[PDB]
Write a protein that binds this ligand. Structure first.
Ligand code: NI
Ligand code: NI
Lengths: 321, 322
């Protein structure tokens, strides 16, 4: 099916830029049609980020179609257009702006300070404790699907930009584990699908979010993993790998409490185990470079801002059911 | 070093078009500059493909810089410009042009015929090495070119992985990449294993290697194009002929004086599992009934063979000349 292909999604977006983008993605699009789309998308992002709420929603939805549709025929042009948007977004976000590199120590300290200081979101705590209702746990898991199901593709984009063969090898090991090792039935998306199904939810591999904060989270994560300055991607990769085994263990026990079997909750179990590291040298190697430090730190801050708004919205939805 | 970065490479190319390409790679390149570069590149490629031998050499040199340079900052714009060239190349290349899909039996027969016509095992380069006829110097020639084929093959496979939207299919390419990059130990990646072999015969294994052989450049440009193509039939064809369908070289190296450890690169690829038995074959088998897939696949295979033959011929001529 084609529900998450670019053209069906654009046909369903009742705004002027939808046809402009569709024309730019057509097989015989001209350079003028592509440039017009890029200009207009950049202008739209700028208005949104300046406070035009309709322009914000429109550019976010368009970026979601551009960056995350599954019709590979249009992927190169879609990513070309996404960059016109990313260039604007990156001008608006608070930048680390270091004139000189932090010491390996002040750098590692800044990371600890960001992390620890501001995972005990009141929602996580509610779920960890075993207090969530069926409907509330279903809300949580529907959103877990969106975060998990195509994470491996974002990691693959970083793999492509790691020119050093040993560094590519590290990402290839990550991907191999994430996709089930020798058995694709055990890929992490498929593990999570088994869990959703155990609690009466469908796990749609063509899922398209309608939650603004989830869209912004997925859009930011794809941007970060695809960025030509791999500091952006390494920041998201780092924080995900560091925090997952801990959250996933508490989620595992909460799910058992909820009446899921050990086999049904396997998704959360496997992360306690496989993720606790070798990938750290990718970061440690680059720490002396201030430009890597600026990208990494800026990316980390931006990730936290979008993640916080996303978790807040999930908590709100859970509270409303 | 920046020997395989785009701008240093363009500086070494006396071609007028090289100046306009370099300008399109600037941080603040305008749409006008990038579009002008794309038009000039497409016109150069077209002239070359219509028999202007200088234009042909020039566009291949430019494509090699665009598609295979290692400065990631310029990669997105470089690949955008490479596609302007690719569209021209695909327009001029001989194509399968099936109106109706072949049955799987007839598709298989055509593959068998194409492979038999290519007769890779009887190429003079191959026979010369298999027969123990190569001196140390001729062996070095052979291995310097093996390096170019091997050292970044995993990256072309990664491009295909990115274009496989089905999670099960991506999983298959991830298994391939894992094996190619040494599984749990990066010291055992296949490029590193080949590096060990080059060193054992007194050659440097340069991860920033830049070819000066026109036929090698054509071969690498084509392989990258095929594996990056949005129609995965193109990349599946090259994956098939490379990985689905070394022992003879392994034997020849041992009989020449190399140890099993030095020649490990060729041992790890020895297999007797038929192509249809490999799990990756299902990527192809699933798509066979689609005529658009067959056309991409058979076009890609035919083109790959033509560039591979010209390249092996060129290596053979170099080996005879040393
Ligand atoms: Ni996982
Ligand atoms: Ni290999």
């Amino acid at each position: 099916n084609t529900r998450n292909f670019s053209l069906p999604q654009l046909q369903n977006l009742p705004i002027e830029e939808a046809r402009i983008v569709a024309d730019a993605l057509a097989v015989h699009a001209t350079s003028r049609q592509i440039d017009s789309a890029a200009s207009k998308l950049a202008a739209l992002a700028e208005a949104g980020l300046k406070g035009d709420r309709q322009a914000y929603a429109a550019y976010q939805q368009l970026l979601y179609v551009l960056s995350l549709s599954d019709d590979v025929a249009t992927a190169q042009t879609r990513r070309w257009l996404a960059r016109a948007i990313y260039r604007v977004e990156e001008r608006f976000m608070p930048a680390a702006d270091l004139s000189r590199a932090l010491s390996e120590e002040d750098f590692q300290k800044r990371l600890e300070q960001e992390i620890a200081a501001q995972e005990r979101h009141p929602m996580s705590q509610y779920v960890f404790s075993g207090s969530a209702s069926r409907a509330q746990l279903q809300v949580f898991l529907r959103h877990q699907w969106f975060r998990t199901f195509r994470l491996y593709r974002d990691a693959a984009d970083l793999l492509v930009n790691l020119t050093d063969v040993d560094e590519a090898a590290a990402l290839a090991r990550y991907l191999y584990g994430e996709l089930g090792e020798e058995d694709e039935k055990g890929s992490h998306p498929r593990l999570l699908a088994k869990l959703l199904e155990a609690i009466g939810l469908e796990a749609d591999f063509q899922a398209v979010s309608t939650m603004p904060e989830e869209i912004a989270y997925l859009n930011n994560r794809a941007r970060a993993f695809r960025h030509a300055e791999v500091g952006w991607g390494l920041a998201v990769f780092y924080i995900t790998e560091l925090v997952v085994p801990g959250n996933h263990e508490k989620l595992y026990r909460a799910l058992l409490q909820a009446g899921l079997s050990e086999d049904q909750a396997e998704y959360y179990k496997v992360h306690i185990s496989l993720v606790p590291k070798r990938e750290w040298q990718l970061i440690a190697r680059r720490i002396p470079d201030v430009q890597f430090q600026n990208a990494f730190l800026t990316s980390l801050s931006q990730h936290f801002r979008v993640e916080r708004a996303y978790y807040d919205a999930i908590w709100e939805e859970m509270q409303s059911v």
